[PDB]
Amino acid sequence: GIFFPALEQNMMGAVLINENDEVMFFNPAAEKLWGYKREEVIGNNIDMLIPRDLRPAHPEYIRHNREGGKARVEGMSAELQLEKKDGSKIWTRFALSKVSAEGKVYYLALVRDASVEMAQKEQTRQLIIAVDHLDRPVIVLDPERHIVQCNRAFTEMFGYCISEASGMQPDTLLNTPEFPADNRIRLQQLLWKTARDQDEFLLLTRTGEKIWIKASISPVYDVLAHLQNLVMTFSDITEERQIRQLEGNILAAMCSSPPFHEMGEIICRNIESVLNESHVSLFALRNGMPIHWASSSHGAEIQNAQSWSATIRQRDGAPAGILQIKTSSGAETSAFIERVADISQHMAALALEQEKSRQHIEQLIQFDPMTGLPNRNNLHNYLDDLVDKAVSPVVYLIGVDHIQDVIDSLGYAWADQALLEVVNRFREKLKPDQYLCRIEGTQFVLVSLENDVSNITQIADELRNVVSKPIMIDDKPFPLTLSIGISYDLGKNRDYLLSTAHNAMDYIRKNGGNGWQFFSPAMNEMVKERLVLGAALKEAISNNQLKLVYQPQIFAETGELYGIEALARWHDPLHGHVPPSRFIPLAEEIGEIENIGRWVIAEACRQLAEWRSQNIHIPALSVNLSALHFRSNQLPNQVSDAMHAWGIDGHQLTVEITESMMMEHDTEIFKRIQILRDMGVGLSVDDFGTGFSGLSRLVSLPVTEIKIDKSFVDRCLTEKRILALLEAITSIGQSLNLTVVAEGVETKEQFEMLRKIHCRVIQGYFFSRPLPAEEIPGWMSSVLPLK
Amino acid sequence: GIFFPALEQNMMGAVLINENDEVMFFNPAAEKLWGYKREEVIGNNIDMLIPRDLRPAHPEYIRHNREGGKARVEGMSAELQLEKKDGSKIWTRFALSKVSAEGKVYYLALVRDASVEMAQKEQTRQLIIAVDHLDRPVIVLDPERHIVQCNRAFTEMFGYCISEASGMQPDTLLNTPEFPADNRIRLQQLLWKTARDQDEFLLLTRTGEKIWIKASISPVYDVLAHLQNLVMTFSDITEERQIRQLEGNILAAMCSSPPFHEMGEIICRNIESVLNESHVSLFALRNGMPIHWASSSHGAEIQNAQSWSATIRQRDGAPAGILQIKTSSGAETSAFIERVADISQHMAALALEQEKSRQHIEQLIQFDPMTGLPNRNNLHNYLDDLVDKAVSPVVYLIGVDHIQDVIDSLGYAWADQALLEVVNRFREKLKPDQYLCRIEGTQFVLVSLENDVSNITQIADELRNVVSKPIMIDDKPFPLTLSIGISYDLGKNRDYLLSTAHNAMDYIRKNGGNGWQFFSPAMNEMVKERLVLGAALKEAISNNQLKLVYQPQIFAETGELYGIEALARWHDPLHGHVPPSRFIPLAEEIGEIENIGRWVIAEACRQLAEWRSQNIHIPALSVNLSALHFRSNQLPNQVSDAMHAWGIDGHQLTVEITESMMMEHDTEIFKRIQILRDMGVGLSVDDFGTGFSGLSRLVSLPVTEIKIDKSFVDRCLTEKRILALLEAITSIGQSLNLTVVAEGVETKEQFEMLRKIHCRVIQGYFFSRPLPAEEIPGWMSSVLPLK
Ligand SMILES: Nc1nc2c(ncn2[C@@H]2O[C@@H]3COP(=O)(O)O[C@H]4[C@@H](O)[C@H](n5cnc6c(=O)[nH]c(N)nc65)O[C@@H]4COP(=O)(O)O[C@H]3[C@H]2O)c(=O)[nH]1
Ligand SMILES: Nc1nc2c(ncn2[C@@H]2O[C@@H]3COP(=O)(O)O[C@H]4[C@@H](O)[C@H](n5cnc6c(=O)[nH]c(N)nc65)O[C@@H]4COP(=O)(O)O[C@H]3[C@H]2O)c(=O)[nH]1
Ligand code: HEM
Ligand code: HEM
Ligand SMILES: [Mg+2]
Ligand SMILES: [Mg+2]
Ligand SMILES: [Mg+2]
Ligand SMILES: [Mg+2]
């Protein structure tokens, strides 16, 4: 047989044993494997080749195998420790063969030196230990981008093992959630990058949780500079992204320069959002003492909690503050607490140097570096100057509320721009004698010098409705609102005024939303009374409870009634008699002048209808109209309706407009005046505030009557210089066909002094007090003529 | 036998080839590796067993080995690929033996399925790559207390390789090379005795520099819970503190909101300081084109520069930039490089997101967040709207020079306060029609609608003069100065207007500032002509080069001279005759009105004395004065001097004022007028801008003459309505003893139509043109009376 020399020249070792456990063959490699010799071993027992641990208990195994008769020798199949002659224990791999030759059971063993293979196995055991020890998910991929090796951290975080996660792309079994736009494409693209790269993904666990991971792919090239493998390292970056969101939010705050305490609050809120059910406290070092900058309002008690304190230092190393975080022990990892506290320490450190720089310069600066408005110090100086000069100012604290919506929808920058738009609206509606300043954030001060409650109410209404129009920000409306606190005393102090106005403003802010309120509710009950009176006036106008009273006008010489003026009256069961000189400005403020005009015109035409049905001539009726009633582009329609519904065509009706209308210069108003005058209804102008150039323009824009006011007729007695007004106006009267109507006559001397200038018509108490309609005909039929 | 059946049932596959290279042996072990059976391999050639890619190459090796005749075949000692019957390939390990018996040479090839062994080797290679990509130094220690396996980070941060550190231990002997650290006994005995230990060392490197390293040690137990292995992970405390400090410093720099290039440079310097001897640069993507953002100015060539590139990604979406850091090879650990790259990549992502946000801020917001003023965007919109409405705007570009003085002396905060001081001054002097904007920093833009030199120069002078008083910063003056460029051209656009204004402003700034300039030629030429004309007027007034010319006023009936009016005339050799309507507004603009008033009064009194020297009665002389002349508390002094230096007491002199003076309401001016009237000098009022109430107050503050303007007298011909104006004015005249003077008569019909109203006196071209004083007595002696 040629196998004997084949085994002699072979690399393996052949040790064939006969029935009596005697070695019948010994190849040269057996000398290297055992340190023996063929002369020493051949013919002798196998006891020399067995490890000393179990030398005598091995013929028992051999004998047990001998009687079985099985073909294959399934035993002796694992790498086993073999001890040499010198005592060294190498690792060998065996391969047995039962040879039943000539009725005798032989045993052949193809021993191979498993030293190198088991050194590889020891190396891979150590590498498995080192790769499962670090808790760092690492996978390895072929050029086809399929997983070939994974680790224990990867299994822990994704729930897949080497058996399941092998041969498939790391996206087929780790598909991203429903959102398909970017995650799937980025995950598929990272796997096919030929250079070192990395990305961040949402991957799905076997159970189904959403975990943000950071995957880093790097190629490993062979000797021939060819792609051999691609290793992917996954980092669980849930906490990393939490701290990154913290960094982003603190950056967006600090770069936008927020207030000190609000910055502390947002820092604390981010820390709590990263560390659930914890307590956070933050202190600055002022004069070496702790000053409480901010802390979370969630002061829940925690048992066996750990408190980590970090000394917030300055740039040069000097201490600046203390940042203390108390949290449940074991709920959040200590190293994560360290990293969060360190990053927040740097953030709050820069915030603290900024605040320290601002601290010794805020008392010296005079302007707000944001909106360009004067600051609290400038306001204090201005108020001190006012009180020293003995002037009583009125302070409006304006709180621009509902700013948090733009804060959390757009950002601090866009919210500050909303503030700028609001203050620019304030500037465009501002007045020369008003002082505007910013005290703290959304809080402004308007210092005015208006004493009247009506003026204060009008200013408050204009301030509250300037923000009624939505604020346009990035093509997104924002309905901001104002809480106004009004403080005013005869004089107490700037501190007192500010404190009272702040009390009012915080009351309004906490008890609802937009609105304005006085301090000292004795000045708010007045507003309530005026509002209820206005509501009563509106409902009386609606329900037709108003009344008109008529005052005859007389000719100078003939003693004949030129006309009667319809003066409004009101009588409420609760308020008694409300004078026109009290409810006409109220109607102007509310917006009831239009309704009053329609009502007076309709009632006047109706009463003309009855006084024509019965035998009364009623030559002319003068109806009072205001500025808004004429500026509205509707008047001639209802005036013509009033004439043609009762046959009272305009040669009888007359309108007296305010001198403010003549002072105003509006082409549309002038055209409407001309159209009305064309219809035959007369026109009268009272008072002489408008100049004689205005009166000549009024000659151009035709009228019929000019009224001399009671304020001038009263001084006609004493001031003899104003007789020229009456004389000249009368002269214009007979020059260009105007009727002059003296008002406010009360005494015989006052009438007879105007008698010489030959005034056309006279109206006042000297001839008839305003008489009710039910006895106007009695006066007509009894008194006229008067002479 | 002991040859054939020995290897038939063996695990090792046995194949034998004879002289004719024909296979003779084949066993089930080789069947399981080739796919064939014992009916297709015996007899036929070895050609089928070879893989298809090596069939022609293989057979020469057998012949070469036969020729060589060597006993031990060193060939095929490595693993070999194997092609099965079906075409699949597996790895196998060969043991080749040659037989020289019976004069024949056979070949036996004991094959073993090296599939599992080579899978183990590939697994070991993959695990080695994975451990090298672990980002933390890891060492594995045997129970014999020595070092077995290292990492790549360990080799990078200590310089010790697997060949040097393997077998023996450079841990017990190299942990305390020169510094004992008082923990060698811990690392020797307590390290293998306790479990889960850790401490800090000063273990040295190849260089020997002292570094603080963590030595976290954990034991790995076997099934018997015995000390199978240990693992020690290292972490450089210096590296950890440096990587925390890098993040802190970068975040602090980013919190200061620096420019984009400065932020890139700051990241560059921080990365270089963390990694000395490095060239670092950043690029930011722009529409897919990577542009240069920042780079390290140290351009010295770096030897063996390994470059690490990182791809910036925002919170979600496409890449935003690149960051490349090239450092000398071996300078720092790859894990250190990767950590620095990751931190700086997230920092650069934050910086790019912040710059995108700032681009949105500069692109959409219409207000500057430092002064509350509109920015260049609002300026563009306003000018575009105006030019689309086709109204020509006038643009002023103002620059506040000399700001570096405040910046250096008091810092940036007080420079900010100075800019807000100037902006508040602009706002205080601002007019409702004007629009104010802040294009950038030192510069501002004011947009107006008035377009004429007399107003442009005035508003530019006001803007330049608003900074006459130094800005009070911390009780310290600072004299800032203004450079203004003015642009106005009909029909042009905002780009042209802004460019021209900036050209003018830049030119004046380069020339030295402290002033303003128009764009384009002939505009500054008109300005210079006006300036030289004003200087000539000033010197002519000083040197008494002006003259007076007198226009007689006649009575309606008697044809007697009521008075003459003194009208200023000037004859300059260069400018010829300069009309009063041309040089009086110039005097108002410059400030020569007072000098003109003194000269006119003095010369009028001198000519009155000269005429009194001979036989001239000259009942009255009228002298024109302006508003600014009477607003100073000096008028009565020189007027009384003029009367009493020539005996021309005010019963002959007369003063006519502007209607704007009576429009104004000043108690001091009224008292001065009353005092002057008490001296006997008359007063006259021209034009009828003031109202009739103003005329009655004028009667209260007595006057003497009312003049009907030529503008009204001309329209008296056509507009028949304004006859009432004259009638009423004359009526007031005879009512309260005023003289009415009708100006600007030209025709006999114009005279006769005003005759019927009985106007007191008439002045115009119908009776006498303005005559020089040298022949005025000739007119007196030859013309009067006129009738
Ligand atoms: N002491 C005194 N007073 C005299 C004398 N002659 C008339 N009066 C008063 O003068 C007022 C006439 O209305 P007015 O002067 O246009 O001033 C009116 C007018 O401006 C307004 N007003 C009155 N009625 C209306 C109306 O229907 N509509 C509107 N829009 N305003 C009205 O209310 C003002 C006050 O009206 P009244 O309270 O009725 O006060 C009446 C009347 O009582 C007199 O010899 N002595
Ligand atoms: N076409 C025409 N013109 C007539 C007629 N009658 C008079 N004039 C002119 O009308 C002007 C009247 O001067 P003014 O209206 O007071 O307005 C004066 C006055 O405001 C100003 N002015 C003239 N002299 C003086 C002066 O000495 N001092 C001051 N402060 N202003 C003066 O210059 C203005 C222009 O006066 P002049 O150009 O000198 O022209 C004079 C006079 O010559 C007439 O029938 N037809
Ligand atoms: C380092 C050297 C050796 C070690 C560690 C060793 C140990 C073992 C072990 C563990 C078994 C299996 C026991 C069982 O399955 O219960 C076995 C069985 C056996 N050994 Fe060894 N032995 C060694 C040397 C040898 C040699 C040189 C031969 C030469 C013929 C041999 C012949 C056998 C036979 C025939 C069996 C019976 C296998 C069976 O019953 O399945 N042994 N020995
Ligand atoms: C998949 C199967 C086989 C492959 C891939 C293969 C390939 C090779 C290679 C690469 C060598 C050169 C090795 C070196 O230079 O280090 C070689 C040599 C040789 N092979 Fe093969 N072979 C295969 C099968 C066989 C078989 C089955 C036999 C004999 C039964 C054989 C006999 C030889 C001989 C005699 C040499 C000469 C070695 C020397 O002279 O040093 N080969 N073969
Ligand atoms: Mg009335
Ligand atoms: Mg009245
Ligand atoms: Mg004049
Ligand atoms: Mg004039």
From Swiss-Prot, chains A, B:
GO terms for biological process: regulation of single-species biofilm formation; response to oxygen levels. Keywords: c-di-GMP, Heme, Hydrolase, Iron, Magnesium, Metal-binding, Repeat, Sensory transduction, Transcription, Transcription regulation. CDD domains: EAL, GGDEF, PAS. Induction: Expressed in the late exponential growth phase and at higher levels in the stationary phase. A member of the dosCP operon. Expression is RpoS dependent and is higher at 28 degrees Celsius than at 37 degrees Celsius. GO terms for cellular component: plasma membrane. This is Oxygen sensor protein DosP. The heme distal ligand is coordinated by Met-76 in the active Fe(2+) (ferrous) form, by O(2) in the O(2)-bound form and by H(2)O in the inactive Fe(3+) (ferric) form. GO terms for molecular function: cyclic-guanylate-specific phosphodiesterase activity; heme binding; magnesium ion binding; oxygen sensor activity; protein homodimerization activity. The gene is dosP. Its EC number is 3.1.4.52. Residues 197-249 form the PAC domain. Heme-based oxygen sensor protein displaying phosphodiesterase (PDE) activity toward c-di-GMP in response to oxygen availability. Involved in the modulation of intracellular c-di-GMP levels, in association with DosC which catalyzes the biosynthesis of c-di-GMP (diguanylate cyclase activity). Cyclic-di-GMP is a second messenger which controls cell surface-associated traits in bacteria. Has very poor PDE activity on cAMP but is not active with cGMP, bis(p-nitrophenyl) phosphate or p-nitrophenyl phosphate. Its cofactor is heme; Mg(2+). The EAL domain (residues 532 to 799) is a cyclic dinucleotide di-GMP (c-di-GMP) PDE hydrolyzing c-di-GMP to 5'pGpG; it has no activity on cAMP. Binding of an external ligand to the heme located in the N-terminal sensory domain displaces the distal heme ligand from Met-76 to the ligand and triggers a conformational change that regulates the activity of the C-terminal catalytic domain. The keyword Manganese does not apply. Residues 530-784 form the EAL domain. Residues 391-521 form the GGDEF domain. Changing residue 571 to A: Loss of cAMP PDE activity. Residues 1-70, 123-196 form the PAS domain. Homodimer; has been previously suggested to be a homotetramer based on size exclusion chromatography. Forms a complex with DosC. InterPro entries: Biofilm_reg_signaling, Diguanyl_cyclase/Pdiesterase, EAL_dom, EAL_sf, GGDEF_dom, Nucleotide_cyclase, PAC, PAS.
